[PDB]
């Protein structure tokens, strides 16, 4: 029993965190095999942040301009290339702590663990979700760029995120490990705004199923709804539309608890209308949307 | 910016998790140097658990009865002893991944990271606080016994908890690494109940300081209070008393934000008597009490491990 926001054990990722310095800028890099991945903005100076020409800035750099530190050992850079917004620094040593890994690009609503690092040193681990506006509500200070988001599949690390920037609202934007930004963001200091965020409806429903599995049933009702009627109500509370895919994904939890997805959807409509009335669901007074249906099943079964 | 419930990096602890099997029972063990620590109830059957004589059960066991697995390598047990509610299995091999570590007993209100394990394999890491009723509101399934709680100080792991049981309300009870239970709990199948819980006042104040640091200021007010007037109000809402030690501990956050502790206490007092009024603090509609003042400083300054 019990339900917690739970991150994956970060050990496999900790052994890949290195410090990458280029001039006066220092951020984190991910050392996998003989390659160190880091945000390409590490090559930017003061007047290269509004409109950097990364191809032009990178051509002017040599391997000896990149100082890579793995623990108290300086790694030697033997090559450099750029793939979208990620810089790849070929080093002269394969990381002996390289786990089995994959680079996976995730979709909004997907959760992952973040290993927050400063100066190539891991300081904390927390669980995040990719918001529907493609930002993450992380916890990052200056120097956290290059900190990564990941999931663990048995013994395989799926790297899904690398931190690049903080938007004016305090939310964070980054890329997958191929340098492709999540969202319409660019790695420039030009005026950028996170779109209006919405609630990840499928995740809230998955979390209501977690609550039912844990014995919290007060919010349940005798109602069901059509998918269309649910979405009309949901949109009014800034909730993401629930697709038939989401309904299918909730199938196992629906079967386990004996509460049809559209039946749980009617509970959600009611909760949105009434609020909680001083009650909590899994120790929370708000509807939690950072647990996917996969997370709920993994944590409960 | 941003404020998250954040655990310590679990890598130093992951290298210590092993699987301990005794008969039909399989749980987790902590392999440090040449010793594997695990809950002593691993030696119990179902009948034994009802009224266990652990000294009697342990004397009947031999070293070969304990199957210890570190990855896909079976460790050979060369000795066994019991220290309170923890079993210590002496093994022939010192764990090469043994970090710098200490066994520390924590106080209620103190937080720590839990590395949830099943079959000696770490599956998740989460942060939590030792509740004032000595339970932890963890997330544990069958097979999680032996999962440990820890903090990291510099490069030293301080092991503070080992999971032993789940109470009927779904809350968890366990021991320090010397086998001493936190709370009035015993390791036996019998009627046990978690006491009425209280809110960790110093932690709520620390979290209000984290909210101020992050730009959430709506709850701040012009008022201040005496420590005694605050504690009279706090006791009424099942909040732990705030000591002068707690006020001193909040000193750095008080200086950083320019809000005196008793000034923040009057904000908390109003939040208790009046509520949030539909507003949130750090995305939460409830007062968060699982961030200590040290956790807030560490997260709002970026201390690394
Ligand atoms: C020195 N340069 C930087 O720090 C990179 C920077 C950035 O957002 N860094 C940070 C990321 N996360 C948390 C932060 C908390 C506080 C301050 C900085 C933080 C800051 C300057 O504007 C941009 C614009 C585009 C891009 Cl891709 C990166 C950046
Ligand atoms: C096989 N026996 C056990 O697992 C030990 C057991 C226990 O609480 N295990 C669990 C601990 N945490 C999460 C659990 C989730 C579900 C089920 C079991 C869980 C279960 C039997 O009663 C007791 C009584 C005292 C003590 Cl010290 C241990 C126990």
XYZ file of C-alpha atoms and ligand atoms in Angstrom:
664
model
C 0.000 0.000 0.000
C 0.865 3.725 -0.099
C 1.295 6.005 -3.078
C 4.220 8.299 -3.554
C 5.718 10.380 -6.317
C 8.573 8.071 -7.018
C 11.661 8.556 -9.154
C 13.778 5.765 -10.681
C 16.995 4.889 -8.819
C 19.563 7.332 -10.250
C 22.799 5.312 -9.879
C 23.043 4.277 -13.541
C 22.765 7.957 -14.544
C 25.074 9.279 -11.752
C 27.977 7.326 -13.263
C 27.454 9.258 -16.544
C 27.442 12.820 -15.150
C 30.492 14.891 -16.083
C 31.306 18.623 -16.015
C 31.737 20.385 -19.387
C 33.508 23.737 -19.526
C 33.926 25.961 -22.551
C 35.523 29.269 -21.717
C 33.663 30.803 -18.780
C 30.525 28.601 -19.139
C 30.301 25.394 -17.128
C 27.406 22.937 -17.325
C 26.775 19.158 -17.142
C 27.363 16.496 -19.754
C 26.222 12.928 -20.159
C 29.153 10.577 -20.764
C 27.982 7.418 -22.556
C 30.596 5.133 -24.213
C 33.224 7.574 -25.696
C 30.786 10.489 -26.212
C 29.845 13.340 -23.890
C 26.487 14.935 -24.711
C 25.677 18.432 -23.437
C 23.598 21.520 -24.478
C 25.255 23.224 -27.438
C 24.790 26.634 -25.692
C 27.933 25.780 -23.615
C 29.892 27.381 -26.559
C 27.986 30.709 -26.205
C 29.525 33.872 -24.790
C 27.638 37.029 -23.520
C 26.581 38.515 -26.894
C 26.010 35.052 -28.460
C 22.767 34.359 -26.544
C 20.157 36.412 -28.450
C 21.087 35.162 -31.943
C 23.885 32.574 -31.783
C 25.033 30.988 -35.032
C 26.035 27.679 -33.480
C 27.568 26.321 -36.714
C 29.811 29.427 -36.880
C 30.696 29.344 -33.143
C 31.487 25.588 -33.215
C 33.746 25.825 -36.306
C 35.951 28.300 -34.340
C 36.372 25.807 -31.459
C 39.072 23.201 -31.109
C 38.989 19.976 -29.031
C 41.295 21.532 -26.416
C 38.773 24.368 -25.835
C 36.339 21.851 -24.217
C 37.415 20.911 -20.688
C 35.609 17.727 -19.611
C 35.874 16.538 -16.011
C 34.656 13.105 -14.850
C 35.151 13.127 -11.082
C 38.635 14.547 -10.537
C 39.850 13.136 -13.890
C 40.071 15.370 -16.939
C 38.886 13.548 -20.072
C 40.577 14.363 -23.392
C 38.267 15.552 -26.170
C 39.304 14.008 -29.506
C 36.338 15.291 -31.602
C 33.253 17.506 -31.586
C 30.065 17.541 -33.590
C 26.626 19.079 -33.200
C 23.344 17.241 -33.547
C 20.481 19.744 -33.436
C 20.808 21.535 -29.999
C 23.129 18.967 -28.434
C 26.906 19.064 -28.605
C 28.653 15.697 -28.851
C 32.194 15.664 -27.533
C 34.057 12.540 -28.581
C 36.442 11.648 -25.715
C 39.484 9.332 -25.546
C 37.938 7.033 -22.900
C 34.753 4.954 -22.930
C 32.848 5.465 -19.648
C 33.274 2.193 -17.752
C 30.059 2.928 -15.856
C 28.043 3.166 -19.141
C 24.747 1.385 -18.527
C 22.559 -0.321 -21.153
C 20.748 2.739 -22.605
C 18.518 4.174 -25.323
C 17.604 7.666 -26.471
C 13.818 7.959 -26.436
C 11.726 11.011 -27.319
C 8.630 11.181 -25.100
C 5.144 12.700 -25.594
C 3.338 15.229 -23.275
C 1.906 13.501 -20.225
C 4.878 11.123 -19.999
C 6.752 11.098 -16.754
C 10.477 10.705 -16.101
C 13.046 11.143 -13.322
C 15.389 14.103 -13.361
C 18.867 13.903 -11.934
C 19.614 17.553 -11.085
C 23.404 18.233 -11.384
C 25.777 21.148 -10.810
C 29.394 21.056 -11.979
C 29.002 17.428 -13.113
C 27.869 16.423 -9.603
C 24.399 14.955 -8.948
C 22.639 16.822 -6.145
C 19.109 15.449 -6.291
C 16.570 13.293 -8.047
C 12.889 14.047 -8.606
C 9.986 12.882 -10.721
C 8.640 15.119 -13.578
C 6.086 14.949 -16.354
C 6.363 16.521 -19.822
C 3.593 19.137 -19.582
C 1.072 19.418 -22.444
C 2.728 22.824 -23.326
C 6.070 20.846 -23.636
C 7.675 22.460 -20.604
C 8.628 20.596 -17.416
C 8.010 22.041 -13.957
C 11.466 21.207 -12.712
C 13.651 22.485 -9.929
C 16.742 23.941 -11.489
C 19.242 26.601 -10.502
C 22.013 28.226 -12.617
C 24.478 25.514 -13.659
C 21.856 22.768 -13.976
C 21.957 22.781 -17.833
C 22.803 19.330 -19.118
C 20.945 17.597 -16.194
C 18.978 14.686 -17.678
C 15.528 13.124 -17.550
C 15.281 9.343 -17.777
C 13.220 6.232 -17.168
C 14.484 2.731 -16.376
C 13.269 -0.354 -18.236
C 14.579 -3.367 -16.278
C 18.369 -2.630 -16.550
C 18.126 -0.155 -19.505
C 18.181 3.615 -19.103
C 15.943 5.478 -21.539
C 17.254 9.039 -21.693
C 14.405 11.285 -22.688
C 15.451 14.764 -21.688
C 18.365 17.139 -21.308
C 17.815 20.477 -19.579
C 18.617 23.618 -21.632
C 16.669 26.627 -20.274
C 14.317 28.300 -17.835
C 11.381 30.288 -19.229
C 10.245 33.554 -17.500
C 7.495 31.743 -15.548
C 10.065 29.498 -13.814
C 9.204 26.456 -15.997
C 11.858 24.544 -17.931
C 12.526 23.713 -21.554
C 14.903 21.141 -22.967
C 15.549 18.610 -25.687
C 15.598 14.860 -26.220
C 19.133 13.316 -26.396
C 19.195 13.923 -30.181
C 19.038 17.721 -29.518
C 15.444 18.191 -30.681
C 13.655 20.589 -28.362
C 10.383 19.602 -26.782
C 7.980 22.409 -27.694
C 8.338 25.477 -29.903
C 11.393 26.578 -27.977
C 14.765 27.597 -29.278
C 18.138 27.809 -27.521
C 18.294 31.605 -27.673
C 17.623 34.294 -25.068
C 14.935 35.757 -27.404
C 11.500 36.351 -25.800
C 9.906 32.925 -25.353
C 6.759 32.023 -23.478
C 5.373 28.728 -22.263
C 1.883 28.224 -23.699
C -1.105 28.005 -21.280
C -0.706 24.737 -19.439
C -3.432 22.111 -19.184
C -4.041 19.146 -16.854
C -3.014 15.694 -18.102
C -6.465 14.116 -17.896
C -5.376 10.515 -18.528
C -2.840 10.841 -15.676
C -5.501 12.203 -13.275
C -7.750 9.237 -14.093
C -4.820 6.830 -13.591
C -4.210 8.490 -10.194
C -7.927 8.177 -9.276
C -7.540 4.421 -10.066
C -4.441 4.344 -7.777
C -6.608 5.925 -5.060
C -9.350 3.279 -5.540
C -6.685 0.491 -5.390
C -5.478 2.071 -2.117
C -9.062 2.107 -0.657
C -9.986 5.755 -1.286
C -13.523 5.583 -2.781
C -15.319 8.703 -1.508
C -15.142 10.467 -4.917
C -16.815 7.616 -6.820
C -20.386 8.128 -8.068
C -23.177 6.138 -9.803
C -22.701 8.093 -13.022
C -21.142 7.328 -16.338
C -20.587 9.735 -19.271
C -19.980 9.773 -22.980
C -16.380 10.537 -23.999
C -17.644 13.677 -25.798
C -19.614 14.952 -22.772
C -16.573 14.366 -20.567
C -14.291 16.296 -22.965
C -16.753 19.225 -23.131
C -16.669 19.491 -19.313
C -12.852 18.796 -19.130
C -11.956 21.554 -21.642
C -13.750 24.094 -19.387
C -11.391 23.294 -16.492
C -8.274 23.451 -18.763
C -7.993 19.677 -18.875
C -6.504 17.946 -21.932
C -8.958 16.087 -24.169
C -9.201 12.387 -23.365
C -8.806 10.338 -26.535
C -9.962 6.761 -27.214
C -6.222 5.832 -26.884
C -6.315 7.138 -23.286
C -9.530 5.183 -22.614
C -7.827 1.996 -23.921
C -4.653 2.698 -21.891
C -6.815 2.872 -18.723
C -8.327 -0.569 -19.574
C -6.149 -2.647 -17.174
C -6.870 -0.305 -14.188
C -10.557 -0.298 -15.133
C -10.525 -4.145 -15.134
C -8.542 -4.347 -11.846
C -10.872 -1.995 -9.949
C -14.147 -2.864 -11.720
C -14.806 0.837 -12.507
C -15.273 1.539 -16.273
C -13.179 4.428 -17.675
C -16.292 6.484 -18.494
C -17.580 5.686 -14.977
C -14.282 7.123 -13.531
C -14.644 10.048 -15.986
C -17.974 10.873 -14.356
C -16.199 10.872 -10.931
C -13.638 13.292 -12.381
C -16.407 15.585 -13.726
C -17.949 15.669 -10.244
C -14.608 16.355 -8.523
C -14.010 19.256 -10.955
C -17.487 20.671 -10.170
C -17.409 20.270 -6.366
C -13.772 20.351 -5.451
C -12.718 18.113 -2.548
C -14.762 19.671 0.278
C -11.936 19.381 2.803
C -11.209 15.778 1.784
C -7.980 14.465 0.220
C -7.243 11.762 -2.350
C -3.994 9.899 -1.652
C -2.937 12.646 0.780
C -3.460 15.344 -1.848
C -5.988 18.206 -1.933
C -5.414 18.727 -5.700
C -5.891 16.269 -8.574
C -2.448 14.787 -9.327
C -1.529 14.558 -13.033
C 2.132 13.424 -12.928
C 1.451 9.652 -12.667
C 0.861 7.911 -15.962
C -1.313 4.769 -16.214
C 1.999 2.818 -16.576
C 3.373 4.439 -13.336
C 0.212 3.535 -11.408
C 0.331 -0.109 -12.491
C 4.089 -0.321 -11.803
C 3.795 1.202 -8.337
C 0.622 -0.699 -7.319
C 0.955 -4.204 -8.867
C 13.413 28.152 -9.909
C 11.062 25.295 -9.093
C 10.551 23.285 -5.957
C 10.195 19.562 -6.000
C 10.151 16.741 -3.514
C 13.673 15.604 -4.158
C 15.552 12.595 -2.919
C 19.341 12.183 -2.564
C 21.048 10.468 -5.543
C 20.639 6.731 -4.723
C 23.707 5.274 -6.492
C 25.844 4.813 -3.344
C 22.949 2.818 -1.801
C 22.070 0.850 -4.989
C 25.533 -0.810 -4.876
C 24.654 -2.205 -1.421
C 21.262 -3.778 -2.165
C 21.242 -7.582 -2.074
C 18.485 -10.233 -1.920
C 18.204 -12.287 1.300
C 16.266 -15.548 1.265
C 15.519 -17.736 4.259
C 13.238 -20.621 3.430
C 10.195 -19.261 1.606
C 10.723 -15.601 2.663
C 12.677 -13.292 0.381
C 13.439 -9.677 1.245
C 16.232 -7.097 0.788
C 19.519 -6.733 2.612
C 22.076 -3.976 2.901
C 25.593 -5.242 2.151
C 28.196 -2.975 3.790
C 31.809 -4.218 4.163
C 31.466 -8.003 4.975
C 28.035 -7.722 6.654
C 24.534 -7.969 5.192
C 21.860 -6.282 7.311
C 18.182 -7.209 6.890
C 14.944 -7.413 9.033
C 15.197 -10.326 11.471
C 11.619 -11.397 10.482
C 13.193 -13.024 7.339
C 13.649 -16.142 9.582
C 9.877 -16.305 10.392
C 7.187 -18.523 8.846
C 3.402 -17.560 9.150
C 2.879 -19.346 12.535
C 6.192 -17.972 13.879
C 5.213 -14.360 13.026
C 2.146 -14.512 15.390
C 4.351 -14.879 18.521
C 8.045 -15.035 17.555
C 11.002 -16.031 19.702
C 13.717 -14.701 17.421
C 16.568 -16.015 19.646
C 15.044 -19.531 19.408
C 14.362 -19.302 15.650
C 17.883 -17.973 14.906
C 19.666 -20.661 16.975
C 18.027 -23.319 14.722
C 19.445 -21.651 11.565
C 22.771 -22.376 9.955
C 24.809 -20.091 7.655
C 23.851 -22.113 4.575
C 20.105 -21.521 5.344
C 20.571 -17.845 4.370
C 20.803 -17.449 0.587
C 22.309 -14.032 -0.189
C 22.374 -12.805 -3.771
C 24.311 -9.707 -4.902
C 23.317 -9.296 -8.560
C 23.623 -12.778 -10.066
C 26.412 -13.723 -7.599
C 25.594 -15.779 -4.531
C 27.473 -14.550 -1.448
C 28.462 -17.149 1.141
C 27.314 -16.464 4.696
C 30.063 -17.264 7.239
C 28.215 -16.024 10.376
C 24.917 -14.704 11.719
C 23.991 -12.562 14.680
C 21.022 -10.446 15.725
C 21.100 -6.843 16.898
C 17.651 -5.824 18.119
C 15.259 -6.327 15.109
C 18.025 -6.513 12.471
C 19.771 -9.672 11.376
C 23.470 -9.359 10.529
C 24.769 -11.933 8.083
C 28.553 -12.012 8.004
C 29.606 -12.816 4.407
C 32.999 -13.973 3.001
C 33.353 -10.917 0.712
C 33.570 -7.215 1.538
C 31.276 -5.228 -0.809
C 33.630 -3.415 -3.167
C 30.937 -0.784 -3.746
C 30.756 0.034 0.013
C 30.527 3.836 0.277
C 31.665 5.984 3.228
C 28.710 5.441 5.613
C 27.325 5.824 9.143
C 24.321 4.439 10.980
C 22.305 7.359 12.311
C 19.040 7.339 14.200
C 16.838 10.242 13.123
C 14.169 12.266 14.943
C 10.524 12.753 13.850
C 10.331 15.559 11.297
C 13.674 14.636 9.760
C 13.444 13.587 6.130
C 15.322 10.912 4.226
C 15.360 9.165 0.872
C 13.948 5.680 0.557
C 15.329 3.287 -2.003
C 12.408 0.887 -2.528
C 13.696 -2.601 -3.488
C 12.219 -5.965 -4.469
C 14.373 -9.096 -4.664
C 17.528 -7.071 -3.950
C 16.794 -4.824 -6.943
C 16.169 -1.074 -6.511
C 12.951 -0.063 -8.271
C 12.344 3.474 -7.017
C 13.563 6.324 -4.880
C 11.384 8.776 -3.008
C 11.655 11.308 -0.254
C 9.713 11.204 2.978
C 9.677 12.343 6.573
C 9.681 10.382 9.800
C 6.190 11.325 11.007
C 5.807 12.616 14.597
C 3.889 9.298 15.225
C 7.107 7.478 14.062
C 5.532 5.989 10.953
C 6.538 6.866 7.422
C 3.947 7.347 4.688
C 5.909 5.243 2.213
C 5.076 3.338 -0.911
C 5.793 -0.307 -0.331
C 4.481 -3.570 -1.736
C 5.106 -7.167 -0.512
C 8.832 -7.918 -0.797
C 9.952 -4.368 0.041
C 11.138 -5.305 3.600
C 14.788 -4.429 4.019
C 14.496 -1.343 1.718
C 16.480 1.481 3.335
C 16.161 5.150 4.172
C 19.234 7.362 3.979
C 20.642 10.868 3.742
C 23.902 11.952 2.117
C 26.274 14.305 3.917
C 29.160 15.260 1.617
C 30.265 11.767 0.271
C 29.001 9.891 3.415
C 25.760 7.957 3.366
C 23.884 8.085 6.704
C 21.600 5.059 6.849
C 18.687 5.938 9.060
C 15.937 3.446 8.245
C 15.179 -0.115 7.241
C 11.621 -1.075 6.304
C 9.989 -3.856 8.379
C 6.166 -3.580 8.181
C 2.933 -2.027 6.977
C 0.291 -0.966 9.520
C -3.495 -1.444 8.783
C -3.846 2.195 7.656
C -1.277 1.652 4.873
C 1.494 3.534 6.763
C 4.916 1.980 7.378
C 7.036 1.095 10.353
C 10.709 0.221 10.518
C 13.941 0.458 12.460
C 17.258 2.313 12.400
C 20.247 0.222 11.137
C 20.908 -0.963 14.712
C 17.457 -2.720 14.699
C 15.728 -0.284 17.061
C 12.196 0.387 15.859
C 11.039 3.927 15.286
C 7.817 4.157 17.311
C 6.033 1.801 19.688
C 5.984 -0.934 17.093
C 7.085 -4.535 17.336
C 8.033 -7.020 14.590
C 5.169 -9.450 15.011
C 1.747 -10.110 13.477
C -0.460 -8.527 16.187
C -2.881 -5.569 16.484
C -0.738 -2.448 16.054
C -1.959 1.044 15.216
C -0.237 4.241 14.194
C -0.810 6.969 16.784
C -2.658 10.192 15.827
C -0.317 12.058 13.535
C 0.655 15.707 13.847
C 2.028 18.252 11.333
C 5.757 18.961 11.353
C 5.515 22.694 12.045
C 9.191 23.583 11.455
C 9.015 21.805 8.080
C 5.847 23.701 7.027
C 7.616 26.997 7.880
C 10.702 25.900 5.907
C 8.419 25.114 2.944
C 6.714 28.531 3.269
C 10.263 30.030 3.020
C 10.874 27.924 -0.110
C 7.621 29.330 -1.549
C 8.789 32.901 -0.792
C 12.162 32.200 -2.443
C 10.212 30.951 -5.490
C 8.026 34.090 -5.708
C 4.874 32.857 -3.929
C 4.162 35.687 -1.422
C 0.353 35.944 -1.174
C 0.271 34.335 2.315
C 2.703 36.829 3.845
C 1.164 39.332 6.207
C 2.252 42.301 8.275
C 1.783 40.354 11.528
C 4.133 38.718 13.956
C 3.441 36.503 17.018
C 5.070 35.289 20.217
C 6.393 31.704 20.141
C 3.952 30.853 22.980
C 0.909 32.320 21.161
C 1.891 30.449 18.011
C 2.262 27.134 19.930
C -1.157 27.612 21.593
C -2.697 27.966 18.093
C -0.540 25.188 16.598
C -1.495 22.641 19.354
C -5.173 23.316 18.479
C -4.624 22.247 14.800
C -2.589 19.102 15.629
C 0.677 20.813 14.744
C 3.900 19.894 16.561
C 5.209 22.532 19.034
C 7.810 24.878 17.572
C 10.856 25.102 19.836
C 13.509 27.859 20.020
C 15.814 25.311 18.275
C 13.395 25.288 15.306
C 13.371 29.111 15.202
C 17.193 29.145 15.224
C 17.309 26.475 12.474
C 15.019 28.717 10.347
C 17.451 31.661 10.892
C 19.245 31.451 7.505
C 15.930 31.300 5.544
C 14.595 34.167 7.729
C 17.691 36.230 6.823
C 17.577 35.285 3.093
C 13.920 36.216 2.631
C 13.722 39.078 5.156
C 10.787 37.418 6.934
C 11.392 36.752 10.675
C 10.401 33.240 11.893
C 7.652 34.662 14.136
C 6.502 36.783 11.162
C 6.212 33.536 9.067
C 4.505 31.907 12.117
C 1.737 34.568 11.962
C 1.276 33.681 8.250
C 0.987 30.004 9.233
C -1.438 30.934 12.043
C -3.687 32.741 9.543
C -3.423 29.853 7.029
C -4.612 27.476 9.769
C -7.554 29.561 10.978
C -8.638 30.717 7.490
C -7.301 28.207 4.913
C -5.911 28.845 1.425
C -9.168 30.319 -0.006
C -8.788 28.506 -3.307
C -5.141 29.555 -3.639
C -2.076 27.246 -3.740
C 1.478 27.483 -2.373
C 4.121 25.844 -4.604
C 1.313 24.148 -6.559
C -0.106 22.610 -3.373
C -3.483 23.226 -1.675
C -2.197 21.665 1.591
C 0.674 22.788 3.825
C 3.677 20.581 2.942
C 5.606 19.280 5.972
C 8.146 16.866 4.399
C 10.883 19.442 3.636
C 13.164 20.286 6.530
C 14.880 23.682 6.757
C 18.097 21.942 5.588
C 16.275 20.438 2.567
C 14.978 23.879 1.568
C 18.456 25.439 1.842
C 20.069 22.510 -0.020
C 17.512 22.707 -2.890
C 17.417 26.537 -3.116
C 21.353 26.649 -3.176
C 22.309 23.498 -5.164
C 24.456 21.346 -2.814
C 25.910 18.311 -4.735
C 26.749 14.581 -3.983
C 24.505 31.150 -18.401
N 23.447 30.633 -19.251
C 22.447 29.900 -18.774
O 22.337 29.632 -17.579
C 21.473 29.367 -19.802
C 20.066 30.020 -19.747
C 19.115 29.295 -18.765
O 17.902 29.368 -18.906
N 19.671 28.674 -17.694
C 19.004 28.091 -16.595
C 18.405 26.831 -16.631
N 17.664 26.303 -15.649
C 17.486 27.031 -14.556
C 18.038 28.319 -14.358
C 17.832 29.080 -13.179
C 18.411 30.309 -13.035
C 19.217 30.835 -14.038
C 19.429 30.139 -15.196
C 18.839 28.863 -15.401
C 20.040 31.412 -19.068
C 19.926 32.549 -20.060
O 18.861 32.393 -21.019
C 18.806 31.171 -21.638
C 18.201 31.172 -22.886
C 18.298 30.050 -23.689
C 18.988 28.948 -23.227
Cl 18.952 27.474 -24.158
C 19.611 28.941 -21.996
C 19.502 30.057 -21.168
C 5.598 -11.940 4.130
N 5.633 -11.072 5.292
C 5.853 -9.766 5.197
O 5.973 -9.195 4.116
C 6.046 -9.030 6.507
C 4.801 -8.245 7.003
C 4.674 -6.837 6.389
O 4.126 -5.935 7.009
N 5.118 -6.676 5.123
C 4.941 -5.553 4.289
C 5.698 -4.385 4.374
N 5.519 -3.297 3.614
C 4.542 -3.328 2.716
C 3.685 -4.437 2.510
C 2.654 -4.453 1.538
C 1.884 -5.568 1.359
C 2.095 -6.704 2.130
C 3.067 -6.724 3.089
C 3.894 -5.592 3.314
C 3.452 -8.865 6.564
C 2.837 -9.737 7.639
O 2.682 -9.062 8.905
C 3.776 -8.348 9.333
C 3.797 -8.069 10.688
C 4.961 -7.605 11.269
C 6.079 -7.428 10.485
Cl 7.540 -6.826 11.215
C 6.065 -7.677 9.126
C 4.889 -8.117 8.524
